[PDB]
């Protein structure tokens, strides 16, 4: 996971609300979530990897193991179980709740970091340059 560390800053959003009103997300809650800009950091001890996401809109942090189911309270204030793994290259975060699951994919492209969060048919591509 080693590409993955580092300081990463928003640069770019495409379809985010369209993929929060799929989740489930409120009015209110889109309209202050979808202007941030955050910063995402990506840090590695052992066998724990730590994103942190820092914004105007709400900090988070979440710490876990890959393949090891985890508990995750996000931005929008779903309570998720999530479990994120590694395939080819790409860091699967699946987020189940409610009867629900999404899934966020972080992979590495050119000097980019590029995050596809998807919710059944609607895909939002968000990408980050390092900060």
Known sequence: ???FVGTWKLVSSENFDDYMKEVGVG???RK??????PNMI???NGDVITIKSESTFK?????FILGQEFDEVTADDRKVKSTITLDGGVLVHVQKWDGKSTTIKRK???DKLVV????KGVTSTRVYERA
């Open 1 to 3: 996971c080693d590409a």
């Open 27 to 29: 009015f209110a809650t």
């Open 32 to 37: 202050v979530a979808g202007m941030a800009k």
């Open 42 to 44: 990506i840090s590695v």
């Open 59 to 63: 900090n988070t942090e979440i710490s």
């Open 108 to 110: 590495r492209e050119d």
């Open 116 to 119: 596809e969060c998807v919710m």
